[PDB]
Amino acid sequence: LVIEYLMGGAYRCNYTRKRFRTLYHNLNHFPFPFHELMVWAVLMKRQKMALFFWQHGEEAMAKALVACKLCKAMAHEASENDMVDDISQELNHNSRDFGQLAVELLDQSYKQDEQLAMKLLTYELKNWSNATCLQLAVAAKHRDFIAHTCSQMLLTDMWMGRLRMRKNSGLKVILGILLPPSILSLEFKNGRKIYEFYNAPIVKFWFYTLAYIGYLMLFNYIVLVKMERWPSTQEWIVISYIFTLGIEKMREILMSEPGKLLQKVKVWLQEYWNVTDLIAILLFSVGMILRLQDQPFRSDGRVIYCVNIIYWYIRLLDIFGVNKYLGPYVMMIGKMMIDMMYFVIIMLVVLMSFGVARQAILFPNEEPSWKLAKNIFYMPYWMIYGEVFADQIDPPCQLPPCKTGAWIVPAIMACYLLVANILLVNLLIAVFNNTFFEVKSISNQVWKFQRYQLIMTFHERPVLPPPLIIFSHMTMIFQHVCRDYGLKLFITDDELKKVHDFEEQCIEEYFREKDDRFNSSNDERIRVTSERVENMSMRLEEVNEREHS
Amino acid sequence: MMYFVIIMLVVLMSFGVARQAILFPNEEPSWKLAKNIFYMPYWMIYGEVFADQIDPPCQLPPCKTGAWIVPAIMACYLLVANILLVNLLIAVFNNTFFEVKSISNQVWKFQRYQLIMTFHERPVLPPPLIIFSHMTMIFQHVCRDYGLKLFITDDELKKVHDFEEQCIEEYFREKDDRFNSSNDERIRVTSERVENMSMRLEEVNEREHS
Ligand SMILES: CCCCCCCC(=O)OC[C@H](COP(=O)(O)O[C@@H]1[C@H](O)[C@H](O)[C@@H](OP(=O)(O)O)[C@H](OP(=O)(O)O)[C@H]1O)OC(=O)CCCCCCC
Numbered sequence A: 001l002v003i004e005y006l007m008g009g010a011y012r013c014n015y016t017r018k019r020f021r022t023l024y025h026n027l028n029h030f031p032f033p034f035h036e037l038m039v040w041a042v043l044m045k046r047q048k049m050a051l052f053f054w055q056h057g058e059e060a061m062a063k064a065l066v067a068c069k070l071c072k073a074m075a076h077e078a079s080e081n082d083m084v085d086d087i088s089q090e091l092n093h094n095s096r097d098f099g100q101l102a103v104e105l106l107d108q109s110y111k112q113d114e115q116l117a118m119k120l121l122t123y124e125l126k127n128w129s130n131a132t133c134l135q136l137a138v139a140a141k142h143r144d145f146i147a148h149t150c151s152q153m154l155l156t157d158m159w160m161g162r163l164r165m166r167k168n169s170g171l172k173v174i175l176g177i178l179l180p181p182s183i184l185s186l187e188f189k190n191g192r193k194i195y196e197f198y199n200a201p202i203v204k205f206w207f208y209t210l211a212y213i214g215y216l217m218l219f220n221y222i223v224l225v226k227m228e229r230w231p232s233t234q235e236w237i238v239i240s241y242i243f244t245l246g247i248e249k250m251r252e253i254l255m256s257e258p259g260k261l262l263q264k265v266k267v268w269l270q271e272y273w274n275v276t277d278l279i280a281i282l283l284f285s286v287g288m289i290l291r292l293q294d295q296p297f298r299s300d301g302r303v304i305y306c307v308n309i310i311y312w313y314i315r316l317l318d319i320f321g322v323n324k325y326l327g328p329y330v331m332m333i334g335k336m337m338i339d340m341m342y343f344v345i346i347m348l349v350v351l352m353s354f355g356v357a358r359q360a361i362l363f364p365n366e367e368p369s370w371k372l373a374k375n376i377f378y379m380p381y382w383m384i385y386g387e388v389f390a391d392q393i394d395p396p397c398q399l400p401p402c403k404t405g406a407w408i409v410p411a412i413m414a415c416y417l418l419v420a421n422i423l424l425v426n427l428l429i430a431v432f433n434n435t436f437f438e439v440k441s442i443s444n445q446v447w448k449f450q451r452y453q454l455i456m457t458f459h460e461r462p463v464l465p466p467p468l469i470i471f472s473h474m475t476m477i478f479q480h481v482c483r484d485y486g487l488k489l490f491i492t493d494d495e496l497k498k499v500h501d502f503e504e505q506c507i508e509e510y511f512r513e514k515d516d517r518f519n520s521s522n523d524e525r526i527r528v529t530s531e532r533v534e535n536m537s538m539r540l541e542e543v544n545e546r547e548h549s
Numbered sequence B: 001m002m003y004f005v006i007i008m009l010v011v012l013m014s015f016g017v018a019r020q021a022i023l024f025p026n027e028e029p030s031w032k033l034a035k036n037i038f039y040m041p042y043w044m045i046y047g048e049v050f051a052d053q054i055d056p057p058c059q060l061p062p063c064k065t066g067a068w069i070v071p072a073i074m075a076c077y078l079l080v081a082n083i084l085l086v087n088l089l090i091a092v093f094n095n096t097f098f099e100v101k102s103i104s105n106q107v108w109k110f111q112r113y114q115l116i117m118t119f120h121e122r123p124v125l126p127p128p129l130i131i132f133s134h135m136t137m138i139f140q141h142v143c144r145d146y147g148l149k150l151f152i153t154d155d156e157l158k159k160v161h162d163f164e165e166q167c168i169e170e171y172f173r174e175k176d177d178r179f180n181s182s183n184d185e186r187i188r189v190t191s192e193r194v195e196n197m198s199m200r201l202e203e204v205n206e207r208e209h210s
């Protein structure tokens, strides 16, 4: 029970199975003893014993990943119940050590044989609640494991589905999705070719992208062109798209992993795209409600549409995030935005000061009105972006008399422009420049980690795009009254034994290489030479002092 | 720059569509709507931010519904395009300059050979007068001392061969002498000799006879 609580919601340890429950309720040996000994050493926080038990037996990498997850969960539980706060550091160090061991073992296995390395990451683990190494590594939030070359190659092979399209893809997928006769000219891995072509994640992604582009074009057409009292066909298509997308979001929030409905919404509202999509759908619904009414309400609904189109235009960054070079740039923008806000507060302060000074100096006969609130922000803000217009600030003053102190406005403006356009923007450039390498590397690692989540969330979605997704939901109603690949890879006993022997060979070679590399370092050689020289000097002094003559 | 201009184009299209749809709600479907999105939002960021043609000052025609959103959308758009993306592009150009410079220098030095060789074959007359050279090639149609190679006699060839043998011998000797004087090799040899000496001394001490 405590193992199942530590691991996750979907995990099911062998102890709580009904076979072991019936075998224990009337109170035999274990097939793999070192699994239970390793779990015992991990739970009771005995690091040396756990490291000794790790290198004996089979399924070494799965054991390392399970140990890393258990240590991370134990550290999280320890730094919650007001503990001594030093147990958490030791548990985190143990988790990091186990993760590093898993990464090094994967590196050795990939270096020795590539196909067997990819084989080792996919086969179903019978002793570990029917999970793969990828699922354990993802559930442990191990960014250095997914970002490895072998994991990325495996993710690419799962993303491409049964097709190959190795040298040049993308265009062929679009041709297939637009020209169904062109499907037959594509090679497949070892009537049925249509089903295997359309069930790949990548063709689902391109179908969804084409549907989104079409919906966006319809939205642009319906907001650009004059609208009548009742909606046109393009507006009906847009409304249908929004409604079906909302239905799909509800279906996703209902079929989530947690069993509690209140827990499902709380875990769904974690990504910012989900909450922003919910807000946008509610806003579009409000605008559509106000649209089908009299003239002022219709105008307000149209303005709601024109505001809402901005978000759906921005949401193209999610589509762009698939590309290898347009995802890290988006994340880099996401962090530099926080830096920009921190540096824009000061610009706002200086702008407010200059605007209030100029407005107070120039116009001393203004009644209290809200126009004074915009005369401060408007023109001092457009000034710095390339609209420095004389005679609009410090006007020439047949000629009306000059206001008292009107000569000070250009003196203030010169210093304001010098501060805003030469000091703060250059300092912001320096800040963006000197904090780019860390942000780039972190963004690359995070994107390579989230590739797995993208692949799974496209492998789970129905094959039809959101404008046609209603037909797929009707099918799910018919199936309501009624994984060979994509996640795992089942095998026989002989292939399992071959994989086990390969893994034992890999771990043995890894330990032997580590020992041979440690024993040949300069520091070890110097230490051993010093000790032997000291002992030899003592022996030689004893020999010289003790002679028969 | 193209990889970074895709995003600028997305944001520009968004702002242009929003402003054009807000301001003018009585436009027939015409191709003029296709350029009203790209034209002015593109000239705005290069120094045409004129504050009288984005939010018109409106004897006075009535104010269009929601015409106060255009300045806010434009302020956010200018802040994104002129402060965030261009500075990030500057950072990208700055932090990927050394590798590009070194690779370009190496590639130019390599292509110098092709540049030199392609002028050693072209006819001496320039393209406006190259017709005369082609006529000459017609006359020569019915009919490399230097520039590429350098033919030499047997004694010069033997001198070059002896020089090359001396060079390769000196190279191998220098490589071996440099390897044998490294710190790692000295430490390894000293450790092995110390181990053997310790074993020998223990065997000598165990070989007492009195
Ligand atoms: C208007 C905006 C619409 C949304 C924009 C569409 C969204 C968008 O911009 O990216 C989508 C698409 C995703 O496909 P993705 O990148 O995953 O697939 C790549 C493709 O297979 C390349 O041929 C591979 O070689 P290369 O390394 O590249 O040399 C590349 O490397 P590898 O993994 O096989 O080793 C593959 O990653 O990215 C494109 O490649 C553009 C293909 C042409 C797309 C044509 C678009 C019409």
Ligand SMILES: COCC(CCO[C@H]1CC[C@@]2(C)C(=CC[C@H]3[C@@H]4C[C@@H]5O[C@]6(CC[C@@H](C)CO6)[C@@H](C)[C@@H]5[C@@]4(C)CC[C@@H]32)C1)COC
Residues within 6 Å of the ligand: A216, A217, A218, A220, A221, A224, B029, B030, B031, B032, B033, B034
């Ligand atoms: C001059 O008078 C023209 C008239 C013929 C009228 O035909 C119209 C048919 C719709 C059409 C082609 C027209 C104007 C706006 C056009 C929109 C601009 C939008 O821009 C795009 C811009 C970029 C896209 C990313 C978004 O959408 C289109 C969805 C959109 C777009 C191309 C939809 C198509 C619209 C012309 C002459 O006949 C006698």
Ligand SMILES: COCC(CCO[C@H]1CC[C@@]2(C)C(=CC[C@H]3[C@@H]4C[C@@H]5O[C@]6(CC[C@@H](C)CO6)[C@@H](C)[C@@H]5[C@@]4(C)CC[C@@H]32)C1)COC
Residues within 6 Å of the ligand: A368, A369, A370, A371, A372, A373
């Ligand atoms: C159009 O005619 C208006 C009239 C109602 C008149 O009420 C007035 C009450 C004072 C009030 C709210 C008004 C105009 C200037 C307003 C100032 C602008 C300043 O800005 C702020 C700007 C930002 C702050 C950081 C600094 O101060 C305020 C201290 C300041 C401020 C909000 C104080 C409040 C002033 C309107 C209509 O009657 C139906």
Ligand code: NA
Residues within 6 Å of the ligand: A385, A386, B046, B047
């Ligand atoms: Na300028």
